Design a protein around this ligand. Sequence first.
Ligand SMILES: [Mg+2]
Ligand SMILES: [Mg+2]
Lengths: 152, 158, 150, 98, 49
Amino acid sequence: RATSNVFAMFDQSQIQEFKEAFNMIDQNRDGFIDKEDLHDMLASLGKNPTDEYLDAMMNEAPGPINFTMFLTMFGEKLNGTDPEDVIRNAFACFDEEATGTIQEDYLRELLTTMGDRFTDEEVDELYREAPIDKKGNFNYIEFTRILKHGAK
Amino acid sequence: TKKRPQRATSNVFAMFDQSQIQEFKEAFNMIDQNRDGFIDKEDLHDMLASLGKNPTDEYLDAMMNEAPGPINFTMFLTMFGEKLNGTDPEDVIRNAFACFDEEATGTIQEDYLRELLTTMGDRFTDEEVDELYREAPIDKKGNFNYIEFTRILKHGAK
Amino acid sequence: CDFSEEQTAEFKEAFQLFDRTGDGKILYSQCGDVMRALGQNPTNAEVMKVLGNPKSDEMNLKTLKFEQFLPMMQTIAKNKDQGCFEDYVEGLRVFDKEGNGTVMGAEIRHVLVTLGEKMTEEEVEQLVAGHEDSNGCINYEELVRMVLSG
Amino acid sequence: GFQACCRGYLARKAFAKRQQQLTAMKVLQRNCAAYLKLRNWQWWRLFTKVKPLLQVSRQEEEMMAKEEELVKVREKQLAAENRLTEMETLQSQLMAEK
Amino acid sequence: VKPLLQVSRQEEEMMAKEEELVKVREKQLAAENRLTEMETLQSQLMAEK
Ligand SMILES: [Mg+2]
Ligand SMILES: [Mg+2]
């Protein structure tokens, strides 16, 4: 957790985007998020679905979610992640030729032979909801966007 | 009960581009005097006093009756999307006019448009065509490509 | 041990970078890689001698620890048969024909592959790489100066 | 004696590539570690749908990029005309010569 | 209100950059075709020489 200033965690652009999102996701803007607003947003986004299981997460945070608590719960889960430019720069280390694609077996071997050894199940879980070419080729240049859930 | 119900619950992306929503948000940012997403009666009153030389009183009452209450970004967007339901993009009509014009350019003539709307086989009356003529630019005939019309209609060549 | 703890900490940290060995151990074949990365310039004969003259099959069926690797590096640093670069820059001049401080890259590759302890084609290429020119020659002086800074 | 320095230079160079590569893999697996639990977060997939609606970039990056790109494209377009004029003279000169 | 908009005014003006860039890009693309055309004519005429 590491309690500290919630504003110093996210970057200027990141905190600005978070504030702009909090100011938008609110049918009755007043610095107080309730289950009704979330249900209405889900109904408007998914073509009127109803998922009553999401209400079982309010107990995690002290009472309703506030903008401060919202930023806190975003930062507590986004810790460790970095922007897309640095991710692409780090990915450019391998391959060398810079083909934009890496073999899936090679990635699995790399993720289980150095640093934090990732189990085979954890590596396989990263492909149960995304496309992939029959000839392998892990399109990293294209997967960087899907990593941020910028689709669907 | 300031919090309004689900009210229909219409989506805000049936067939609208991100640029349209961005423009709508930027426009709402100027009307809302409180700067909190609550277009009250005073906001629109000041907007009209600054732009359209003040309203006629009944304008605010009609706008309030046409809305479920304190209008905001989401409510206004949903209302305008429901009102625009059925309207196709400008590129579709542009390509249609370009492919229909025999001159390989996409022009439209007043005399030819009259026959295309009437004798072609439609339910267009005299006033139906007079309104379109009045809505046209300075010229009552499209002697150029179907671009200036879409521009003056949407206020954005995109 | 006649070795300060300051550099010993860095040596332990560098040795712990391999990891891929089951635990805090090290293979016989991979011993030279870690011995040459930390410092010094031991030869294949010196590596085989300090290792106790391991068998041909012993280089892939046993693993050592750090308590045994530290004295190896200590002896390699204290006892050594290397030499300064003044003798190396003067040795490569035997192949220089015109004597203008340049030598053909093919001749150097052949001398490194055949003469001496022999080297694989994958290493000699990476060694001679970067110093390519129009006449295909590689200045031995610049090569030695770059190898010394490595 | 010289082969030892060449062999050590490769081990040292290869070791340096592994040192920086090892740290690079840390950011990769670290970014993917939190992504697992974050992937199944009901608040993430719902909020990502709103990011396209905000567009924090605004004209701060579009105007600067378009302005800087317009200058490069302007000089490139003008440069093409310069090469075209030079080729026109050579093409016309070769025509008179031929 | 669309004609005014203090903030949207820059958007319409910013679109001129993309429009001018696209317009300038069109001339560059057309110039590339003309440049290659002169190269073929220059090379063809040079071959005849
Ligand atoms: Mg709220
Ligand atoms: Mg308001």
